[PDB]
Design a protein around this nucleic acid. Structure first.
Ligand SMILES: [Mg+2]
Lengths: 70, 29, 172
RNA sequence: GUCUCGAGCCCUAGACAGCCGGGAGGUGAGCUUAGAAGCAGCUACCCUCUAAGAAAAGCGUAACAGCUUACCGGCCGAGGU
């Protein structure tokens, strides 16, 4: 029912494309409050118990695209 | 005795106080 | 070295010279086990394969004799089963058992019937498209099963187009 | 083929092999692209659950799927490499 994480980052960032080279080329930007809201949405999709460890999985897609957290 | 076996035997004792042969070695303790 | 084999309750094995005869509820398998300085015996109800020598050549046979005895035990208890399925593409092949020999007719369109022979006691029974080779002596069964597949050997043409013939489906 | 000898490393906290079981999710990585979802190509190769499980090693598919391989567990029981 709930759409994927790859389609949830492009809504609260600005850009719709990735990059020619991941990690090295920094395109999009997120924040502290901009990650704890994407964690409020996914529950049957994630295997994590805590609300702390659930955040670590969203980041596991971001640094491999070109996103810097402030 | 490899290091990983000892770190595991002690980690099983951490969930007893609070492989099948690695459970047995944690039971006798 | 020495290897002691426990003979089951359904099984009874007797010795006469170098010959071993294994009797049970499925039949009687007689075999001749011979090799230098190896002696096989029956200690009442255990089979003992022992030799004073421990060289690799001797260890090869002590091992082979064990599997020849262990497999003779299964022969007299449960028995040996090899399953075969007849396959044909264009020609209506007929596989009928006639006497102490299994016969195949009209193979690839031939007027001449291809006939093999049943080795020993072995029972080859057909249930339409299937065939099941069964018996106590694995030596006779595995060979009678082979003889059937091998009877449809075609070396003259490409086997990838001409795939007709009985094949082995189930190996025990 | 077989015999004798030495050396390093693994092993009853159960090795080697074999057979069984498991082989998970975020997630079809992203870009490339109508498409590529372990496995065309470029670059990265990151973290959850757990006893394990690769940004996938080998095959396989137009692509999925399927089969395994790393990796964990069980059976077994003695030396193994
Ligand atoms: Mg020709």
């Amino acid at each position: 029912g709930v759409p994927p994480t790859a389609e949830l980052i492009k809504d609260e960032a600005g850009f719709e494309t990735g990059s020619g080279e991941p990690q090295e080329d920094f395109v999009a930007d997120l924040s502290v409050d901009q990650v704890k809201q994407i964690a409020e949405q996914k529950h049957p999709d994630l295997l994590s118990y805590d609300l702390t460890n659930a955040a670590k999985e969203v980041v596991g897609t971001c640094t491999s695209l070109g996103v810097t957290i402030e | 005795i490899p290091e990983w076996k000892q770190e595991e035997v002690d980690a099983i004792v951490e969930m007893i106080e609070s492989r099948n042969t690695l459970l047995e070695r944690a039971l006798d303790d | 070295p020495r290897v002691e084999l426990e003979i089951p309750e359904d099984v009874d094995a007797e010795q006469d010279h170098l010959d071993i005869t294994v009797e049970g509820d499925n039949g009687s398998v007689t075999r001749r086990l011979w090799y230098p300085d190896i002696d096989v015996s029956v200690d009442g109800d255990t089979v003992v394969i022992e030799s004073d020598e421990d060289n690799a050549k001797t260890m090869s046979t002590i091992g082979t004799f064990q599997s020849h005895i262990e497999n003779m035990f299964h022969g007299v208890t449960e028995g040996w089963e090899y399953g075969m399925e007849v396959f044909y593409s264009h020609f209506p092949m007929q596989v009928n058992v006639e006497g102490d020999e299994v016969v195949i007719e009209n193979f690839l369109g031939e007027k001449a019937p291809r006939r093999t022979t049943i080795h020993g006691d072995t029972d080859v029974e057909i249930d339409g498209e299937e065939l099941t080779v069964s018996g106590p002596d694995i030596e006779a069964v595995g060979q009678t099963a082979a003889d059937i597949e091998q009877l449809t050997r075609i070396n003259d043409k490409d086997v990838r187009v001409f795939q007709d013939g009985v094949y082995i489906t189930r190996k025990p």
